[PDB]
Amino acid sequence: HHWGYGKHNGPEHWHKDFPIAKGERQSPVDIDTHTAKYDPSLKPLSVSYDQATSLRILNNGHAFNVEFDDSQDKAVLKGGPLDGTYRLIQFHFHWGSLDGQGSEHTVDKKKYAAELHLVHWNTKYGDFGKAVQQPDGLAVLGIFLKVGSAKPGLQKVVDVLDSIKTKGKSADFTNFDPRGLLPESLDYWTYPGSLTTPPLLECVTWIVLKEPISVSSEQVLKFRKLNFNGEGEPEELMVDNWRPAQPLKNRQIKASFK
Template identity: 60%
Template sequence: MSQRSLTWGYNKDNGPHTWYKHFPIARGKQQSPIDIQIWNAKFDSSLKPLNFNYSASTTRRIVNKGHSFEVEFDSSTDKSVLSGGPLTEKYKLTQLHFHWGRRDEEGSEHSIDDLKYASELHMVHWNTKYSTVSESIHQPDGLAVVAIFLKVGGAHQELEKITHALGSIRKKNMSTVFTNFNPACLLPDNKDYWTYSGSLTVPPLLECVTWIVLKEPINISKEQLSKFRSLYSTMEGEHPKKHIETNCRPRQSLQGRVIRSNLI
């Protein structure tokens, strides 16, 4: 692990306000997340419906990354692909992860007219016109990330499969096999969206993302959220033990970017 990868987190000494010291692009002009102001979003009749073609056969494992957890997918095949919407290419699903806050009402990274949700799910896809994920992240159209808001309500039955697995990856760098899970089960019924050009919300903060933010949230229960926060950002044997209490980057300036929407 490089020294640089150890320099960022969400604590007072290494939180988002310090990231620019090691990742100067943090002060770039296309940074994410942002506040989506509905009055300022432009309806674009050329935007197409989104096509989610996912398969449970591509799910591989779930891993504690120390700042979040990821469900990883096999993207060597074309079995889990996103197309349509603002995209002109096919994008393969490589991983999904969540962001959450210290309190249930402020865990999303993006917001709508300054309204935040309990959590935010990111489904990360890479552009098939490039050879690898590593190559794609250095291209302005390299990634397409679908953001889905989660609001506190009843337990999400399909999400329960993920939260149940978290007990096996409590410490940083722990992983377990996680298969036969179709991520389509986490999509809301209504797939209307906003889209804009932005960046990764974690270092290296590269400006390579076409963001697709779905309007309709899905549910998560307080108990399920508490399992997110039960994860540790520290490794086995490392002291003091620290929970991942929050992993949200503050909203960034729009810097003149246009937010487009298929919402009339």
């Protein structure tokens, strides 16, 4: 027993072990597209994933992470609101029990079927563990998923999920190209926030893409076959692993586009 997304250990409970849950820069938030400020001074995002090296896929009991070799500058995010260089460590998703919910960020209160998080750490801090302890330690690129046409670049991920059904299971996952998960446009909103799960540390520059990607009904259905539990423990489907929108408080969301 620990934090999760159930009746008894879900988002409304987290503050009791992680008091920063009620902090001043918590994520996710609703993106009010009409209050967001266009900043013509924001640089284009630079996503350089051509040399990415995926290693493994892991069911951690809260989601599944596709992990990368982050020991060199092989897959990096720069530009936009960011100073310096951020290294890709892993990506994961949050999703719903139904197509009408699943995203963590919302857009004018709209919820998408899922949300992809590509997690990067600021190389000036040397590694991920040190980066999460810093106010500008992480840059998370968030991408919304809507149900429609299939995303061919997602299919290799979908097909390996059968081998990591339960908490603690991992599988080799090499040569996966995260460029296949991106939409056409790199137009984005950006704001200062936090990890959306415990420990909820306020270490994230959020960069959320305006353009969702489309995935098929069958692709998201396969996410919903995963389990929160370990093998041989009672089966609970890994669904609705999203935190709802948190108060914006003293924050402005910026937009890269008019």
